[PDB]
Each structure stands twice: as structure tokens, then as C-alpha cells.
Amino acid sequence: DYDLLIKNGQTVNGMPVEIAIKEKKIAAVAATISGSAKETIHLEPGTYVSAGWIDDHVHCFEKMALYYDYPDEIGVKKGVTTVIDAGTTGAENIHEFYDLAQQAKTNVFGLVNISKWGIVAQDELADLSKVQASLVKKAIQELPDFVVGIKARMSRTVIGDNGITPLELAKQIQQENQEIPLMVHIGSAPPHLDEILALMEKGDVLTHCFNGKENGILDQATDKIKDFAWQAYNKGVVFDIGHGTDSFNFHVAETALREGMKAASISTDIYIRNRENGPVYDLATTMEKLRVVGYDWPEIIEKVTKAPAENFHLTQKGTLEIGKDADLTIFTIQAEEKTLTDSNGLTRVAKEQIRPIKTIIGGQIYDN
Numbered sequence: 001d002y003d004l005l006i007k008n009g010q011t012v013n014g015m016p017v018e019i020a021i022k023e024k025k026i027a028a029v030a031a032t033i034s035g036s037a038k039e040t041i042h043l044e045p046g047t048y049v050s051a052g053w054i055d056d057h058v059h060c061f062e063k064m065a066l067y068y069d070y071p072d073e074i075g076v077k078k079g080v081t082t083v084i085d086a087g088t089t090g091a092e093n094i095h096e097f098y099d100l101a102q103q104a105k106t107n108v109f110g111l112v113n114i115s116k117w118g119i120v121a122q123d124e125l126a127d128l129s130k131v132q133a134s135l136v137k138k139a140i141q142e143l144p145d146f147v148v149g150i151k152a153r154m155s156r157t158v159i160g161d162n163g164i165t166p167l168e169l170a171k172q173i174q175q176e177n178q179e180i181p182l183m184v185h186i187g188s189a190p191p192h193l194d195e196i197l198a199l200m201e202k203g204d205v206l207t208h209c210f211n212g213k214e215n216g217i218l219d220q221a222t223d224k225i226k227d228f229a230w231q232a233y234n235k236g237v238v239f240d241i242g243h244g245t246d247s248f249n250f251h252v253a254e255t256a257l258r259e260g261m262k263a264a265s266i267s268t269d270i271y272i273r274n275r276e277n278g279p280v281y282d283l284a285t286t287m288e289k290l291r292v293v294g295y296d297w298p299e300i301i302e303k304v305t306k307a308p309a310e311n312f313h314l315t316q317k318g319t320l321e322i323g324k325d326a327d328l329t330i331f332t333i334q335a336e337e338k339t340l341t342d343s344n345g346l347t348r349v350a351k352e353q354i355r356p357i358k359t360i361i362g363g364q365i366y367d368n
């Protein structure tokens, strides 16, 4: 006896798979599962199945000013079972966000911005009084089932004249909360990338890793990846895509690949505006971009499941292991040209498209 059984599936590696579900958890996984269940799904031959896709850089607090979106429009409806809001809210408004986040079909987690009001303004790190370690600690102790880390947006328009100081505070706050995961956003200088990378350690997540700005990882003068960027990479700093409206450049990603560098995790930095009007329409589209860059589907899948799950300690998600939460994404991969545009207007023609057709969350089935 099981609650749900999925048959005739196949992993991205070409492995036959069937999953048995009971009590919102994965009860069994094998090439063939002969058992009874309330409902049984019979997938069409050639259909792929993986752990529920996870987008670890999102903005889905629907009540926020401009930077917002609706959880299920970027989640379940796009084959994404779990999303992590990248610091849209601070300790002062995360509760209002948390309450709304519960009514979503999609699992929603969040990073608390070190600035108490989150991204209300554009420069929430320009006024240091807003960065109270105490308030962050309280949020972390108040919502352990929701807060999986802290966001620090280290770029020109955010920090005003406070330079690198906000990051030091971020590292201190991390120290004060059991080394909770820290996500670092980079953009234009100040601060300079090298100064930022120097303070980050293995486990710290560097989002917008392949942005094409001058202060990015590519040395535009030599057309090579800066040495200190390789150093941070080599020491374990987790490179996260966080595509966004202006943070993903094809040339940078391609150059990195040629040098043997790949992002650890693929994310969208999506919000209603770049979702509706592009350049980032959804996770699938972002995945197709790294596919065209050169990554293969198996590693791509791992980068939107196991990796993000590990980056933020989602111990119960990310893999099709017995005992884990029953979150799955069922999709197809087809040969069909499609135009893809990055954050800087560079275009590439994709030859393969990935499309979710069924999404399972906590054992519940959702079509499309």
C-alpha cells in the first residue's frame, strides 16, 4: 500500500524509474515497483522525472513594491516545487511574507535580508542603522521552518558609501547564527569583486556569478576569468546564476566553461517584470541557456535540485531518496529551435527545450 505511484518514468541519465509515495514522503524508488496505491500515474514513454526543481534565488513576496511576484506563478506552474526568496524582506516584514507564503502550493523558503526592511528602497545598505544583528537573530529563531539563510546585496546602488562594511556585518551575523547560509549579490563596484570574494568562505553563495559587468568575474581586457575569481571558486565559494534582468551574460558563462568553470547552481532571480517581459521567463528557460552554453542535461538537472538543496540545507529535498519529501518534476526534452536572450542583449539559438508537464508537491499532483 502506497498513496501515490508513478510508473514508466526515466531519469535524465536514461535510467528507468518508478516512485512510490506515502504520507507526503518518498516510500520507494526502483526501475519497477509492483504495489498497491490510492492513485497510480502511468507516464508516456520518453517522459523524464527528477527531484522537484528548486530555484534558490527568487522574489515572491507579493506585497512588496516593485520587486515582487506570486509564488505559484514562478513555482508549481513552472515545474518548480520549491523556491527561496532572496532577501526581499528583513526581520521587520518577513512575518507578513511568511503568512502569505503558507497558502502557496509551492514550498516557499526565504533568506532574511540583513537590513530589517529588506529591499523596500533600492539602497537598503546605505543606512547602517537598518542592519541590526539582533533583529536578524530573532527572525531566525522565530521562523526556523522558513528562514534558511541571509541575503547581502553587495553592489554600488545598494551600499551607498558603506563600502565593504555591510558584508563584514553579514559574516558576523552568520557567526552569531550557527553559520547559517549566506547569499552574496554582486554587481557594479563598489565594492570591488576581489574585496568581496576575499571575505567569503566555502559554503557562501555567490549569486549573479556570470554577470557581464566590469566588476564581474571576466577580465574584459584579456578576455580571461580573473585569477581571484578562480581562487574563490577553487576554495569552495558556491557560484549561483541568479540570472535576473541584468546579471547573466552568455559570453561570460561560455568563457568560464572553456576554462573549465561551471556554476554550482542555476537560479533565475525572477520577479514579475522579468518573468512577463523577459529576459528570464522561468527556470526552464534559464536551464536551456546553460544547455546552449555547453552544460549537459544531467548536470543541469543536478544544478536545480541537489545543488540548491545542499546550498541551503534542505535536507528533506533535492533527491529521490527514500524518506525524503515527495516533491518531483515530470518533464520532456525536445529538439526545437528557440531564441534565448541574456541580461545584456546577447542572443543564442537553443536546439533543445525542457518542459514540465506534471509537478508533484508533498505528494500532491499538479498538471503543467
Ligand SMILES: Nc1ncnc2[nH]cnc12
Pocket (backbone or CB within 6 Å): 155, 157, 185, 187, 244
Ligand atoms: N539585483 C538587483 N535588483 C534590483 N536592482 C538592482 N540593481 C543592481 N542589482 C540589482
Ligand SMILES: [Zn+2]
Pocket (backbone or CB within 6 Å): 153, 185, 186, 208, 269
Ligand atoms: Zn541581486
Ligand SMILES: [Zn+2]
Pocket (backbone or CB within 6 Å): 057, 058, 059, 086, 244, 269
Ligand atoms: Zn534578486
